[PDB]
Design an enzyme around this catalytic site. Structure first.
Site, PDB file in Angstrom:
ATOM      1  N   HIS A 141      55.434  39.040  55.390  1.00 20.91           N
ATOM      2  CA  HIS A 141      54.378  38.056  55.224  1.00 20.91           C
ATOM      3  C   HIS A 141      53.381  38.123  56.373  1.00 20.91           C
ATOM      4  O   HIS A 141      53.694  37.706  57.492  1.00 20.91           O
ATOM      5  CB  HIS A 141      55.005  36.669  55.135  1.00 20.91           C
TER       6      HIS A 141
ATOM      7  N   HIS B 225      43.764  35.314  57.682  1.00 19.20           N
ATOM      8  CA  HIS B 225      44.156  34.406  56.609  1.00 19.20           C
ATOM      9  C   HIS B 225      43.221  33.206  56.484  1.00 19.20           C
ATOM     10  O   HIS B 225      42.672  32.964  55.403  1.00 19.20           O
ATOM     11  CB  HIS B 225      45.585  33.918  56.815  1.00 19.20           C
TER      12      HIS B 225
HETATM   13  C1  KIP Z   1      53.343  23.580  35.626  1.00 17.98           C
HETATM   14  C2  KIP Z   1      52.816  24.853  36.299  1.00 17.98           C
HETATM   15  C3  KIP Z   1      53.801  25.331  37.373  1.00 17.98           C
HETATM   16  C4  KIP Z   1      53.550  26.821  37.671  1.00 17.98           C
HETATM   17  C5  KIP Z   1      53.735  27.187  39.158  1.00 17.98           C
HETATM   18  C6  KIP Z   1      52.378  27.128  39.865  1.00 17.98           C
HETATM   19  C7  KIP Z   1      52.510  27.585  41.318  1.00 17.98           C
HETATM   20  C8  KIP Z   1      51.113  27.918  41.841  1.00 17.98           C
HETATM   21  C9  KIP Z   1      51.026  27.774  43.370  1.00 17.98           C
HETATM   22  C10 KIP Z   1      50.124  28.871  43.927  1.00 17.98           C
HETATM   23  C11 KIP Z   1      50.739  30.261  43.583  1.00 17.98           C
HETATM   24  C12 KIP Z   1      49.693  31.429  43.610  1.00 17.98           C
HETATM   25  C13 KIP Z   1      50.360  32.794  43.948  1.00 17.98           C
HETATM   26  C14 KIP Z   1      49.292  33.908  44.089  1.00 17.98           C
HETATM   27  C15 KIP Z   1      48.707  33.904  45.523  1.00 17.98           C
HETATM   28  C16 KIP Z   1      49.819  34.206  46.583  1.00 17.98           C
HETATM   29  O1  KIP Z   1      50.426  35.295  46.540  1.00 17.98           O
HETATM   30  O2  KIP Z   1      50.106  33.152  47.489  1.00 17.98           O
HETATM   31  C17 KIP Z   1      49.864  33.186  48.962  1.00 17.98           C
HETATM   32  C18 KIP Z   1      51.142  33.359  49.855  1.00 17.98           C
HETATM   33  O3  KIP Z   1      51.463  34.759  49.987  1.00 17.98           O
HETATM   34  C19 KIP Z   1      50.970  32.813  51.296  1.00 17.98           C
HETATM   35  O4  KIP Z   1      50.677  31.406  51.342  1.00 17.98           O
HETATM   36  P1  KIP Z   1      49.363  30.929  52.167  1.00 17.98           P
HETATM   37  O5  KIP Z   1      48.817  29.620  51.636  1.00 17.98           O
HETATM   38  O6  KIP Z   1      48.477  32.126  52.218  1.00 17.98           O
HETATM   39  O7  KIP Z   1      49.921  30.645  53.690  1.00 17.98           O
HETATM   40  C20 KIP Z   1      50.318  31.706  54.619  1.00 17.98           C
HETATM   41  C21 KIP Z   1      49.472  31.770  55.918  1.00 17.98           C
HETATM   42  N1  KIP Z   1      50.162  32.493  57.008  1.00 17.98           N
HETATM   43  C22 KIP Z   1      50.484  33.868  56.587  1.00 17.98           C
HETATM   44  C23 KIP Z   1      49.278  32.749  58.177  1.00 17.98           C
HETATM   45  C24 KIP Z   1      51.344  31.635  57.334  1.00 17.98           C
END
Ligand code: KIP
Length: 301
Positions: A14, A56
């Site tokens: 990550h 990020h």
């Molecule tokens: C009823 C419907 C229920 C259905 C489920 C719905 C779920 C939807 C929630 C969103 C899911 C999108 C996934 C696609 C994007 C992705 O890969 O996410 C980013 C992640 O890698 C890092 O998270 P950050 O926010 O980038 O934080 C880190 C920052 N860092 C690395 C510096 C700690």
């Protein structure tokens, strides 16, 4: 079919392992690959002069000594800053602590000698082009970011910049994604050969209504929990597999980056994890003998 249903179990660093190294730095990536991570995971923004840089947040405030929005600064401005200025082990980047909290602050700026094997540049914000140069043969999970959640033009600007660059490499071992589904659709239009993973609305639509995610999707990249709902369960991954998709699980505040959690997600048949502790995950996999890409072994379910 889908080659990614066999690429398991993946240790996807990550941002390189934000709890084990300065997030989105070459140090972190070079470290993370060296101890056995099969795949990098990183974030992309764009400079004022339209250079894709690996960071990020929309602002450099949290992970460096500077201030401002990445899109307001040139690459030359961004590159001189210390992308480890506020790193603290176990806690990603946290400003305002006693300067001795920060074991790698100042190495980019030359005030401390780098750990053996690294240059001061391994601690700045890198161009995505330089990360690709450095890992010609490591798959990279790239996520398109924007200036703010509602600034749809900034995601589309980045999607354009990203597809152009990734096309020029002629490579295919990427998974491009975004929380903004429009960015994914626009990226997939500009670069149809490159694997993607669904944005937020595609995930909701798949989970809730069965609607298959955008053509070209290789994997569903899901947090463990979202707004109380448990996503990364054995059952959900049973169905995603049945429908031909891989499942990669990330954490990032939705569930603890710890050993019991990594184990439960491994036991849930996820094909990849995105740990903030890639060293800790690599040890769990080695200790349990879990199948890995190429290297066979135990199938935990
Ligand atoms: C009823 C419907 C229920 C259905 C489920 C719905 C779920 C939807 C929630 C969103 C899911 C999108 C996934 C696609 C994007 C992705 O890969 O996410 C980013 C992640 O890698 C890092 O998270 P950050 O926010 O980038 O934080 C880190 C920052 N860092 C690395 C510096 C700690």
């Amino acid at each position: 079919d889908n080659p990614w249903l066999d690429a398991r179990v993946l240790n996807m660093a990550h941002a390189g392992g934000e709890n084990e190294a300065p997030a989105n730095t070459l140090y972190a990536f070079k470290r993370a690959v060296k101890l056995g991570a099969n795949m990098l995971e990183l974030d992309v923004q764009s400079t004022k002069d339209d250079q894709l840089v690996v960071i990020h947040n929309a602002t450099v405030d949290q992970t460096t000594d500077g201030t401002g929005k990445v899109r307001d600064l040139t690459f030359e401005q961004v590159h001189e800053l210390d992308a480890a200025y506020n790193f603290i082990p176990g806690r990603h980047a946290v400003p305002g602590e006693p300067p001795e909290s920060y074991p790698l602050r100042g190495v980019r700026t030359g005030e401390k000698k780098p750990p053996p094997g690294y240059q001061p540049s391994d601690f700045a914000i890198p161009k995505l082009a330089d990360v690709l140069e450095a890992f010609p043969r490591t798959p990279i999970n790239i996520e398109i970011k924007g200036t703010s959640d509602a600034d749809i033009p900034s995601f589309l600007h980045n999607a354009k910049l990203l597809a152009r660059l990734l096309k020029k490499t002629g490579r295919t071992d990427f998974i491009v994604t975004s929380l903004n589904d429009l960015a994914v659709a626009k990226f997939h239009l500009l670069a149809p050969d490159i694997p993607i993973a669904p944005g937020m609305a595609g995930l909701a639509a798949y989970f809730l209504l069965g609607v298959k995610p955008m053509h070209g999707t290789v994997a569903l990249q899901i947090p463990v929990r979202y707004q109380g709902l448990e996503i990364a369960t054995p059952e959900f991954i049973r169905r995603a597999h049945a429908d031909g998709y891989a499942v990669h699980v990330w954490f990032s505040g939705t569930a603890p980056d710890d050993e019991a959690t990594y184990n439960r997600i491994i036991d849930s048949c996820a094909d990849g994890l995105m740990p903030a502790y890639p060293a800790l995950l690599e040890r769990i996999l080695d200790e349990r003998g879990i199948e890995r890409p190429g290297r066979p072994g135990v199938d935990p379910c």
